[PDB]
Amino acid sequence: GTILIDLSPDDKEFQSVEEEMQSTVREHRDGGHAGGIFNRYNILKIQKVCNKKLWERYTHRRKEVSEENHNHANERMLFHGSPFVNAIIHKGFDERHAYIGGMFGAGIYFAENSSKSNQYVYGIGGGTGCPVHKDRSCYICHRQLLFCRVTLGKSFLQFSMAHSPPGHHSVTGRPSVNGLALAEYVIYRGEQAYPEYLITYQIMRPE
Numbered sequence: 630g631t632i633l634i635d636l637s638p639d640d641k642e643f644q645s646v647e648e649e650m651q652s653t654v655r656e657h658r659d660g661g662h663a664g665g666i667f668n669r670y671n672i673l674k675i676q677k678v679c680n681k682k683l684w685e686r687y688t689h690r691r692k693e694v695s696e697e698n699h700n701h702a703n704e705r706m707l708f709h710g711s712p713f714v715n716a717i718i719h720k721g722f723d724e725r726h727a728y729i730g731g732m733f734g735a736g737i738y739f740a741e742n743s744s745k746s747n748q749y750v751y752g753i754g755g756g757t758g759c760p761v762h763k764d765r766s767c768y769i770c771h772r773q774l775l776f777c778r779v780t781l782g783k784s785f786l787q788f789s790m791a792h793s794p795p796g797h798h799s800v801t802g803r804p805s806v807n808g809l810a811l812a813e814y815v816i817y818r819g820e821q822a823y824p825e826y827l828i829t830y831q832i833m834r835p836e
């Protein structure tokens with residue numbers, strides 16, 4: 630039931646999604662090992678992901694969480710990078726999309742920094758890089774990220790499928806060492822995220 634609608638680059642919605650993608654690149658402590666070396670992206674396409682059944686699954690859960698949290702869903706727009714992006718946009722998020730070994734347990738991980746999600750496009754640790762050249766810093770191959778609507782509800786703050794900590798709907802990984810890193814978030818129910826935008830891009834080689 631999923632259809633993908635291309636956004637025009639002239640569209641304010643394209644421009645705002647692109648700006649969030651570009652403006653949340655940072656340097657990574659691995660020197661680029663997992664995600665490659667770059668300061669910005671070449672955005673090739675931004676598509677709106679439209680699926681009525683998946684949207685209603687999301688809004689149903691969102692209302693549940695809101696009602697458990699003084700009418701506050703605590704909804705964010707966050708990045709997700711994954712080898713399973715095609716399954717996700719067709720079938721929705723589920724336990725198969727969880728990062729089993731993540732530092733906050735087996736859940737589905739989201740980033741404020743697009744460059745954090747970029748590290749997972751080719752797998753954990755960047756896997757073996759792009760399928761064509763086996764290059765985690767490939768500047769040729771097209772990558773995809775999701776920009777997702779995520780319900781956090783009451784989030785457990787960790788200074789840094791399983792179940793959420795009791796009394797909570799998600800976990801927040803607050804960086805405590807790298808002062809430039811933005812937060813990361815984990816949900817333990819696939820129904821708490823909707824993959825709203827599919828972004829196709831290249832990383833760009835610094836000049």
Ligand SMILES: Nc1cccc2c(=O)[nH]c(-c3ccccc3)cc12
Nearest residue numbers: 709710711728738739740746749813
């Ligand atoms: N640990 C993370 C922090 C912030 C964002 C992500 C992410 O986008 N994907 C992933 C990811 C996605 C699929 C399978 C394994 C890991 C992890 C991640």
Ligand SMILES: [Zn+2]
Nearest residue numbers: 759762767770
């Ligand atoms: Zn490549």
